[PDB]
């Protein structure tokens with residue numbers, strides 16, 4: 001059963017609704033981005049039209065093996081007609097190929113679905129500035145004031161400086177970065193750049209990165225592990241056991257590992273500043289957890305919503321508990337009363 005918050009009223013459209021079988025009345029299935037909770041249910045045997053970005057479409061074709069005839073890529077920032085309804089895709093500032101969708105209903109209603117997003121003031125000068133939005137389907141992942149984290153720029157600065165210092169002190173140190181999905185590519189690309197190395201990785205991850213339209217990508221990544229001093233591994237292997245085991249496989253080339261685990265928010269953020277972050281260490285292995293977020297902080301979310309002034313908000317995350325729903329509704333009312341809409 002498809003839940004109400006994945007349906008677009010007055011249309012034959014659903015958003016990120018691939019795990020409910022054939023949805024009654026659905027003429028087009030939109031996919032905001034290539035993350036498993038959102039594409040859950042898509043496969044090579046899917047036979048309905050899928051609307052998405054060019055990058056998302058590359059991944060559907062190459063990773064999930066969806067047939068080309070059912071993939072409908074749309075350009076960003078461009079008015080398009082889909083089954084008689086005007087739509088626009090906007091960059092979501094999430095992972096590569098992630099979009100927000102503007103729907104212009106035949107009756108005059110305007111709906112924005114953010115997908116997953118990290119709100120930014122640059123969105124206030126997109127095609128959103130042009131008109132009123134009546135309903136907002138909002139990524140509420142971190143909709144509570146305790147959720148603070150630094151900018152992506154500050155986090156990258158910390159990681160670059162940390163890696164460069166360690167490897168300059170010890171040329172036989174290896175840097176390892178964890179991953180379990182697309183997104184957060186800047187972490188490992190920025191580190192490899194400062195160290196004058198390509199990033200080494202599995203054939204499967206290399207394949208995924210080749211779908212993302214990153215400029216000069218052939219210059220930045222490789223499957224030849226031996227030529228590389230920045231390696232990518234599955235997030236599950238970023239622990240003392242997993243990393244000891246990996247060091248053994250490198251054949252006495254290295255005698256130290258420095259590893260990074262990009263997480264979302266962690267309770268550590270309430271106490272410590274990014275400058276003061278320290279690793280967990282065991283012998284010749286150190287592990288840094290760094291708060292690189294691709295979702296809005298509470299303050300970023302509040303600013304976007306108070307700017308947009310929607311008439312109704314429909315949360316799409318943390319909808320499963322009454323306590324969550326009650327908390328989110330209280331903040332929406334606070335924001336409205338403070339700003340005056």
Ligand SMILES: CCc1ccc(C(=O)NCc2cnn(C)c2)s1
Pocket residue numbers: 107108109110134135311312
């Ligand atoms: C509470 C959230 C809303 C959903 C749609 C709204 C709206 O007013 N749309 C324009 C419009 C005017 N007349 N008709 C029929 C639609 S308000």
Ligand code: NI
Pocket residue numbers: 033035094116
């Ligand atoms: Ni996501």
